[PDB]
Design a protein around this ligand. Sequence first.
Ligand SMILES: c1cc(-c2onc3ccc(-c4nnn[nH]4)cc23)cc(C2CCN(C3CCC3)CC2)c1
Length: 237
Amino acid sequence: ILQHPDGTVLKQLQPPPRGPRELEFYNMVYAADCFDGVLLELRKYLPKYYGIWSPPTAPNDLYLKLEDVTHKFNKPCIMDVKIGQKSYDPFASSEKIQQQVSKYPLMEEIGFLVLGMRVYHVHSDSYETENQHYGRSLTKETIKDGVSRFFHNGYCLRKDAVAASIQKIEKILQWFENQKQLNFYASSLLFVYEGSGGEVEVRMIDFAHVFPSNTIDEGYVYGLKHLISVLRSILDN
Ligand SMILES: c1cc(-c2onc3ccc(-c4nnn[nH]4)cc23)cc(C2CCN(C3CCC3)CC2)c1
């Protein structure tokens, strides 16, 4: 992710087939002739899409120009959560399935994985960052506290942001409960709140493994529901 002062991020297309798939996903969704009400509603929950972008002198070098979801924040607190029971897609090999499950074998059980968080602490005027290994360390025993960490400013638990996150996730869940045409693997929710009341972003990102489907995305739903349940329990801290 490259953060542009103009309020966008540039995301470089991943190597094929993933990068091209993500381009096609955005293209399909933000198709200017798209009257599909499912895809029209989905736009609300994605970064705004400004089309494919390449440097003036390098047509080879492909990026997506996306809304920076953090842009309107002063001190954004950012958490990326991979959603679903499976982070491998329907066309993965045995090896690829094994690669994906081994990365985090609790994916089926929990239905989400914290990819990272960046949390502004007021009293130190600084950020705590957690990486891949943080979320991949979390077990059933420690997931609730693992998530809670995101909402700690080093003086209070930001229950406002927790409650707001549930409310926004709920609308995304409603979207998924009303569509049977897309299944989403290894995709994420980007949570943002103000670290400097209820000012929150929750957006879907990372679409290198979104496939056509005939069924409810049950794995994504399970993850949203479980994530909500964790967030709900945190409101009782
Ligand atoms: C500032 C802005 C964004 C961001 O803001 N708007 C965004 C829109 C899309 C994406 C995006 N799409 N695909 N992957 N990221 C990312 C966006 C994302 C971040 C961080 C960038 C680093 N990622 C990594 C670290 C854990 C995974 C966590 C999220 C920081």
